[PDB]
Symmetry: C2
Subunit: 295 residues, 2 copies
């Protein structure tokens, strides 16, 4: 059987202030912990990516769930997607409002409907039918995200390979500050925000959503693995192309079908954590990687 | 400079009546002739594909715009996308209601916003701001589609090469009958419903939306072409993969950057037309195609 693994990311960002880096560090550790605990007890790859991303959705420090960036009207509209590498089954939602966990709604879509993608009002109606609670929009809005919008005017992901050799990705976001109402980015679109395939691996992406969509970044990365590039070579070429062709920045996490993994980015930073062989691997800036024991 | 070509499809289907067959025929002719007419003036591939699809949207015989299938609530919800292969510029709309031409709105997303994808309420607000008429909902509902919805309760596209060497695709659809509220197919999702890249070619797809999304059909087709496979080989490989892996049948059209083109499908039938060099090709069933001179 396969030694399991989970990689998590807290999105592409520019420079991060001293004190924020600590709470971001705290957030990543817990997310990878939730995911690795699931894998260490024979939970599936899908269960693991879902668990890790709920933690980041629940933590107001991250642009997904509580703490999502606000649209051009000071409201939170969220996108999410999840994918099962075994049969390529998938679920996704876009521009969802007044719910706590977008990623959980995407897994409902995957397992419970005959569809792969629901949006906006239809996503709300399915949620309520699934008994997903309705939370006031203000429970998702932070004070820092109010400040960010008022100044602009004037993502999170996980991959996992489980003990059976199944792979999975999940991605969840509030989008991009000052976005038009109903703007949908890459995060709920398979092949762009993420892709999972047992015969190759699983990728989750972050960064400029419009660019990620244009180059199909997640699927693109896996293409290169199929050519015989390493996970790191594949990440370099795909992000390189998004930079060269459309002038877009971001980052990605990937795991191969055989357990190889990397976190690479072309923006300044990308908080990432990994857990494989009882250890925790963490970083934010290039080559700041710390390795700790994860009992 | 290249000889322009426009290829159009009127969506995969099971067996079709001989009467409707001819009604579909003339509409395919209408669309391809509009798109070719656009290229004849030396117009862009984006202009041509938008023209071909608008014509199919207005046509009641095809499942896009007027004549879109009904969702569970007896309503019309539409998806469309458009991509410019030169710079990968793209525009898409999902779950749009009560407007004539979703493909026209997708282009407005592409050329009049920094976003690539709008959905539901946000797209409809953007439709108001661009002065798009909010027409009556019942006008898109056809009697034929009501019967199909009662029974279940008991896609169109175009690729072009222009004389400047540019490629584009446009796809539009009402989705599938009795679909859940806010269900999103492949049609508006870049890499699935279509892809256009001046350095490879362009593709527009049709068939079971969830299957097309899961395997990213349009982009997979183009991966084979990059790998040196012929347009037909490539379409047969991607369709072949979709059938075995996720048990979905579909169809596509593809035009390479060197002007080579094909329509292939694994559904029972796919009405299609291609206009090139003063000849209009047309088929619905495999093998039998009529070629006639174009004035
Ligand atoms: Na959060
Ligand atoms: Na129509």
């Amino acid at each position: 059987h396969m030694n399991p693994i989970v990689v998590v990311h807290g999105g592409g960002a520019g420079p991060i202030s001293k004190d924020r880096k600590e709470r971001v560090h705290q957030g990543m550790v817990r997310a990878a912990t939730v995911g690795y605990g699931i894998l260490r007890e024979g939970g599936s790859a899908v269960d693991a990516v879902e668990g890790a991303v709920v933690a980041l959705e629940d933590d107001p420090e991250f642009n997904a769930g509580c703490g999502s960036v606000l649209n051009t009207n000071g409201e939170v509209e969220m996108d999410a997607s999840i994918m099962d590498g075994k049969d390529l089954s998938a679920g996704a939602v876009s521009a969802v409002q007044c719910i706590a966990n977008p990623i959980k709604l995407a897994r409902l879509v995957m397992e419970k409907t005959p569809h792969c993608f629901l949006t906006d009002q239809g996503a709300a109606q399915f949620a309520a039918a699934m008994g997903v609670p309705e939370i006031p929009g203000e429970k998702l809005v932070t004070e820092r995200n109010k400040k960010r919008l008022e100044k602009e005017k004037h993502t999170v992901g996980a991959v996992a390979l489980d003990c059976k050799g199944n792979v999975a990705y999940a991605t969840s976001t509030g989008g991009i500050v000052n976005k038009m109402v109903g703007r949908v980015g890459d995060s709920p679109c398979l092949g762009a925000g993420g892709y999972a395939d047992n015969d190759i691996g699983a990728v989750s992406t972050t960064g400029h959503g419009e660019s990620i969509l244009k180059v199909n970044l997640a699927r693109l990365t896996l293409f290169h693995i199929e050519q015989g590039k390493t996970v790191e070579e594949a990440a370099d070429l795909s992000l390189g192309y998004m930079k060269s062709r459309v002038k877009g920045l971001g980052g990605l996490i990937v795991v191969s079908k055989t357990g190889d993994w990397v976190a690479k980015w072309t923006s300044t930073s990308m908080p990432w954590a990994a857990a494989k062989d009882g250890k925790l691997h963490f970083g934010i800036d290039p080559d700041d990687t710390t390795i700790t024991d994860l009992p």
